Protein backbone atom coordinates (compact mmCIF):
# COMPACT_ATOMS: atom_id res chain seq x y z
CA UNK A 1 0.00 0.00 0.00
CA UNK A 2 2.14 2.89 -1.13
CA UNK A 3 -0.81 5.62 -0.49
CA UNK A 4 -0.94 4.51 3.36
CA UNK A 5 2.98 4.67 3.73
CA UNK A 6 2.78 7.91 2.35
CA UNK A 7 0.02 9.12 4.51
CA UNK A 8 1.16 7.47 7.74
CA UNK A 9 4.81 9.65 6.60
CA UNK A 10 3.03 12.71 6.64
CA UNK A 11 0.75 12.66 9.22
CA UNK A 12 3.48 11.69 11.58
CA UNK A 13 5.87 14.02 10.86
CA UNK A 14 2.64 16.49 11.34
CA UNK A 15 2.16 15.15 14.96
CA UNK A 16 5.81 14.99 15.93
CA UNK A 17 6.72 18.25 15.05
CA UNK A 18 3.67 19.79 16.15
CA UNK A 19 4.00 18.41 19.73
CA UNK A 20 8.09 18.60 19.97
CA UNK A 21 7.70 21.89 18.26
CA UNK A 22 10.63 20.78 16.13
CA UNK A 23 11.12 20.03 12.31
CA UNK A 24 12.23 16.21 11.26
CA UNK A 25 9.50 8.66 -1.67
CA UNK A 26 6.73 10.43 -3.40
CA UNK A 27 8.99 13.26 -2.66
CA UNK A 28 7.83 16.52 -4.42
CA UNK A 29 4.47 16.52 -2.73
CA UNK A 30 5.16 15.22 0.47
CA UNK A 31 7.01 17.91 1.20
CA UNK A 32 3.52 20.27 -0.51
CA UNK A 33 1.11 17.82 1.67
CA UNK A 34 3.66 18.63 4.82
CA UNK A 35 3.53 22.44 3.71
CA UNK A 36 0.26 22.47 3.06
CA UNK A 37 -0.63 20.34 6.34
CA UNK A 38 1.01 23.10 8.47
CA UNK A 39 -0.65 26.23 7.10
CA UNK A 40 -4.65 24.52 7.72
CA UNK A 41 -3.99 22.37 10.19
CA UNK A 42 -2.73 25.01 12.41
CA UNK A 43 -5.24 27.89 10.95
CA UNK A 44 -8.13 24.99 12.18
CA UNK A 45 -6.27 24.55 15.55
CA UNK A 46 -6.60 28.32 16.01
CA UNK A 47 -9.70 28.91 14.92
CA UNK A 48 -11.52 26.11 16.59
CA UNK A 49 -9.38 25.95 19.35
CA UNK A 50 -12.69 26.55 22.41
CA UNK A 51 -13.96 23.32 20.52
CA UNK A 52 -11.00 21.18 20.40
CA UNK A 53 -10.02 22.63 24.21
CA UNK A 54 -13.74 21.17 25.06
CA UNK A 55 -13.40 17.43 22.96
CA UNK A 56 -9.84 17.21 24.43
CA UNK A 57 -11.79 17.47 27.89
CA UNK A 58 -14.62 15.11 27.07
CA UNK A 59 -11.78 12.86 26.20
CA UNK A 60 -9.91 12.90 29.60
CA UNK A 61 -6.53 11.58 28.60
CA UNK A 62 -4.62 10.58 31.36
CA UNK A 63 -2.71 7.57 30.13
CA UNK A 64 -2.19 5.01 27.45
CA UNK A 65 -5.02 3.26 27.95
CA UNK A 66 -6.95 6.04 26.71
CA UNK A 67 -4.98 6.51 22.97
CA UNK A 68 -6.45 2.86 22.65
CA UNK A 69 -9.73 3.25 23.08
CA UNK A 70 -9.59 7.03 21.10
CA UNK A 71 -10.18 4.65 17.94
CA UNK A 72 -13.94 4.03 18.89
CA UNK A 73 -14.78 7.59 19.81
CA UNK A 74 -12.71 8.82 16.63
CA UNK A 75 -14.19 6.45 14.00
CA UNK A 76 -17.21 7.43 15.31
CA UNK A 77 -16.41 10.64 14.83
CA UNK A 78 -14.63 11.20 11.26
CA UNK A 79 -17.13 8.31 9.74
CA UNK A 80 -20.42 9.89 10.60
CA UNK A 81 -20.74 12.59 7.54
CA UNK A 82 -19.11 13.42 4.04
CA UNK A 83 -15.96 13.10 2.16
CA UNK A 84 -13.96 16.29 1.74
CA UNK A 85 -10.61 17.70 2.31
CA UNK A 86 -11.72 19.71 5.16
CA UNK A 87 -13.22 16.94 7.33
CA UNK A 88 -9.78 15.29 6.82
CA UNK A 89 -7.72 18.11 8.06
CA UNK A 90 -9.89 18.91 10.90
CA UNK A 91 -9.82 15.41 11.58
CA UNK A 92 -5.47 15.19 11.24
CA UNK A 93 -6.00 19.10 13.54
CA UNK A 94 -7.03 17.92 16.09
CA UNK A 95 -4.86 14.74 15.69
CA UNK A 96 -1.65 17.44 16.23
CA UNK A 97 -3.98 18.63 19.14
CA UNK A 98 -3.94 15.37 20.74
CA UNK A 99 -0.42 15.09 20.41
CA UNK A 100 0.36 18.65 21.59
CA UNK A 101 -1.73 16.87 25.12
CA UNK A 102 0.58 14.02 25.11
CA UNK A 103 3.48 15.32 25.47
CA UNK A 104 2.53 17.55 27.93
CA UNK A 105 1.68 14.35 29.83
CA UNK A 106 4.72 12.26 29.05
CA UNK A 107 2.73 9.92 27.25
CA UNK A 108 4.28 11.23 23.98
CA UNK A 109 5.54 7.44 23.41
CA UNK A 110 2.01 7.19 22.46
CA UNK A 111 2.15 10.34 19.65
CA UNK A 112 2.87 7.83 16.67
CA UNK A 113 0.70 4.95 17.66
CA UNK A 114 -2.06 8.00 17.24
CA UNK A 115 -1.16 8.88 13.94
CA UNK A 116 -0.80 5.00 13.04
CA UNK A 117 -4.58 4.87 14.23
CA UNK A 118 -5.59 8.09 12.88
CA UNK A 119 -4.00 6.56 9.08
CA UNK A 120 -5.67 3.43 9.26
CA UNK A 121 -8.56 5.25 9.39
CA UNK A 122 -8.07 7.87 6.91
CA UNK A 123 -6.95 5.20 4.36
CA UNK A 124 -9.25 2.46 5.43
CA UNK A 125 -12.49 4.03 5.13
CA UNK A 126 -11.57 6.61 2.12
CA UNK A 127 -9.41 4.93 0.47
CA UNK A 128 -10.94 5.06 -2.82
CA UNK A 129 -12.16 8.64 -2.25
CA UNK A 130 -8.24 9.14 -2.24
CA UNK A 131 -7.08 7.44 -4.73
CA UNK A 132 -9.81 9.23 -6.82
CA UNK A 133 -8.44 12.99 -5.67
CA UNK A 134 -4.85 11.49 -6.62
CA UNK A 135 -4.04 11.48 -3.16
CA UNK A 136 -1.79 14.25 -1.49
CA UNK A 137 -1.96 15.73 -4.69
CA UNK A 138 -5.66 16.50 -4.74
CA UNK A 139 -4.68 17.69 -1.07
CA UNK A 140 -2.66 20.42 -1.99
CA UNK A 141 -4.76 21.21 -4.87
CA UNK A 142 -7.53 21.64 -3.01
CA UNK A 143 -5.93 23.94 -0.43
CA UNK A 144 -3.70 26.54 -2.80
CA UNK A 145 -4.13 29.80 -1.97
O1 LIG B 1 -17.28 17.69 12.63
C1 LIG B 1 -16.17 17.62 11.85
O2 LIG B 1 -16.04 18.19 10.84
C2 LIG B 1 -15.10 16.78 12.26
C3 LIG B 1 -14.31 16.13 11.32
C4 LIG B 1 -13.32 15.26 11.79
C5 LIG B 1 -13.10 15.04 13.17
C6 LIG B 1 -13.89 15.72 14.15
C7 LIG B 1 -14.89 16.59 13.63
N1 LIG B 1 -13.69 15.57 15.56
C8 LIG B 1 -14.55 16.32 16.53
C9 LIG B 1 -14.30 17.84 16.63
C10 LIG B 1 -14.76 18.59 17.87
C11 LIG B 1 -13.30 18.58 18.38
C12 LIG B 1 -12.85 18.25 16.96
C13 LIG B 1 -12.42 15.07 16.13
C14 LIG B 1 -12.35 13.54 15.83
C15 LIG B 1 -11.06 12.97 16.36
C16 LIG B 1 -9.87 13.20 15.60
C17 LIG B 1 -8.63 12.74 16.06
C18 LIG B 1 -8.56 12.05 17.27
CL1 LIG B 1 -6.92 11.68 17.78
C19 LIG B 1 -9.70 11.79 18.03
C20 LIG B 1 -10.93 12.26 17.58
CL2 LIG B 1 -12.24 11.94 18.66
C21 LIG B 1 -12.63 13.09 14.33
O3 LIG B 1 -12.14 14.07 13.44
Not at 85 to 109: C, D, M, P, Y
Request: aromatic share 8%.
Amino acid sequence: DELYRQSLEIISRYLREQATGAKDRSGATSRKALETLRRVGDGVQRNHETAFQGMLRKLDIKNEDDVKSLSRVMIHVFSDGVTNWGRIVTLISFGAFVAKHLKTINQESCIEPLAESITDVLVRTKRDWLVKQRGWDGFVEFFHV
